[PDB]
Amino acid sequence: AEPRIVVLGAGPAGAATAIGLRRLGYAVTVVSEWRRFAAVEGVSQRVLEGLRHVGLGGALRQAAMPATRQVHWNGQQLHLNQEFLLDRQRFDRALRDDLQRAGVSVVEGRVREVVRDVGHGIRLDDGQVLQADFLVEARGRQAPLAADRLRGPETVSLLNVWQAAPGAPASAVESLADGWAWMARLEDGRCYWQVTLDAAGLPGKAGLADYCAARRADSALVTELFDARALASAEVHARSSTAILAGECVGQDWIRVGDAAMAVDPLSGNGIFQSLSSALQAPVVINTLLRRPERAGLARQFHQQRIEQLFLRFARIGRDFYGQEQGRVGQPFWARRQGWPDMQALHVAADWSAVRVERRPVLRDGLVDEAEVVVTADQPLGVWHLQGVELAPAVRELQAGRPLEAVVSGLSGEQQRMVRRWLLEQGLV
Template identity: 40%
Template sequence: MQAAADALILGAGPAGVALACRLAAQGLLVDVIAARRSPAWEGLSPRVIVGLRRAGCGAAVAAAGEPARRAAHWNGQSSTLNHEHLVERARFDAALRRDLRSAGARLTEASVASLRRVDGLWQAFDVSGAPLSRAAFLVEARGRRAPSAGVTLDNGPRTVAIARIHQGDPGPAASAAASFADGWVWMAALPDGRRLLQFVVDAALVPPRVQLSDFHASLAAAVPEAAEWIARRAPLGVATARDATAALRGGLVGADWLRIGDAAFTSDPLSGHGVHSALGSAFAAAAVISSLRAAPDALPLVQRFVEERNADLFGHAAAVGNAFYRMERRWPERLFWRERSAWPSAPSPAAASGLRRQPVVVEGRIVEREVLVTPRMPRGVLTIEGVELAPLLRLAGAHESTTELAQRVGHTPAHVGTALSWLRQNGFLHSGGGLPLV
């Protein structure tokens, strides 16, 4: 068997690949094991493209292509929103694999049937019992397919996405979303003439697999925007269904293992946070692994960082989705809209402005620092323009000039001036420049 790796990542989606590229750039030997995904399409926001570039995933960025126009038909009104990049996951995943190899990670295309610790190392085995990889650290990044671990801390209403592709004449790429009495539909068109209808409905409405295609066809005929989207287009293959329930899991990190991306929490598809959250979890995971490798006794702080971060992001995504559901007011008594407009049952209370000690990432490691919390930024802000805010806040109360403050904190007057402006705008300093308000 080949030499043991520093890290073994299960899954080659955006989260797993971004993390592998980050770790490989730090000089770690990284193994990635991934099975082929089921066919799917995805809409990527412009900020996802920014995250892919930051991760060094140039091939994936190229595969995303140019952004397509996006429209919405919601609450009886139609509007043109912004744009999204439409990707066919098979092509996009192939590009992610190219990025993996370019980064120097070792990729094995296989399904992991079991995991065991042997002589202090994680070992992965296929269904026949053949070993696939050995590594000191294990990362679970297989998304919703990942075996469950720990406990589920929160669940949204059980939701299923049912998709089917139709083929017609070539045309411009575009996407749209439309609400209807029992859910909503995401519609996507690729330039080669293929068009996707993905209906998002309550799990209670989903029929047995053998009836999925007929159910999909009945929804397409009943929703005017969907019927127009696939008019004069023939279906390709059968309809497929996948779970789309929002879920927050606990037990996400140990001394030599970590769950990231959709293996840690999943968002309602209406929140639009899926791939962006996955990339963010990869960047945070790199700091988690570096911290635990350097200082195993940092585990309690790392656990707090991971659990709080995921809970905050999950809550934010839930609130975004809830806001969109409440915008649709035509069917308040229908099961789908009633449950999703009421979940989460109570929004997270707004954070009070002030100072709080919290685990944060500094120079690639997780450390505890004082951050400034605002209602808009409940996880807190450590720095502005590289200037640490808590020490600056204390010094600013002494009425020193910006130049004097810059000398004391070791930054340029311009950067300190920007940080002071942020403190004033967020109520931490009197506008006149004097005393802290916290």
């Protein structure tokens, strides 16, 4: 009498969630399409061990290759390295091995339609119908269009892909007047160029090839890095790269993870990590939805609020990157992106007067429960405990006028010093 869990999509987020469910003891089936266009992304040192932290590190090193990287930004020609390139062709095909290794069924196929048929009726292009008691939606930006909770400045990434001479790997980033470009050349000679711009005023389909060709032809970086440019014959692709927080991300028997839940624009070079963050606690939410469905409200709130806070944090991190470009002051592309989503600092200022004790969702023993937590400026979702020491009783007593020394007198001296340091950081000084 075990639930049928089906995950749609086998990118980083779907794969991560599937393996997490396996570790909780769940049988899991993943459905996803074999491949898509040739895309290579920039990945940091963190992402790759973060990707093995989740258990996808096998899918990793034959898809990732080291490469130098010229960075042009704020008037500085800067030659960084120790960041890699990830070939999503190798990567996604390799993700399926790690899933089968973990005991996950990988049913290849494009999903046609999902229907409310007792459970979930997942109808595939080849006519097969897979029944799901629980559905994980993990098809990335290709997820079915729902309403948005938040939407940033409309943004498009235009991509050129072509073939050049092998054996000369490199990558680069340059700030342009009305956008920025990322480009890469793999060791086998595959070439990549992707420019990120405001969606407004771009040409239609027929004009995109000429538009990209002129931009590549205008770049001294493109000339240096690429001997053959294939200005006329390069494939041309257009990707929506708008920052999007999904309107709905969890139900009684479904959950969205990854880009299907939230995605910010790709300036950070950290999207895969950010998508993994959105799936990190998806398995415990599912575990609650299945083992204690009476607590679905709490579990749903836990996932929604985590996803929204992640989205906002990554959006502000990206904003600060845009803000490092200080030589573009009259340009609408940059001004719009240097002030979005807002001007709030990444670490908010304390306000002890505003601290509240509230009953909020918490994680305990693999299930979303509810507990009195302490809500602060820096933690809108609340802090439950520090190393087992629940804070709400202390803060209740402090707000009732009990002196701090008495409030903490029952803990060990080390726990007393731990609690005092937290209170200082929350503005009780």
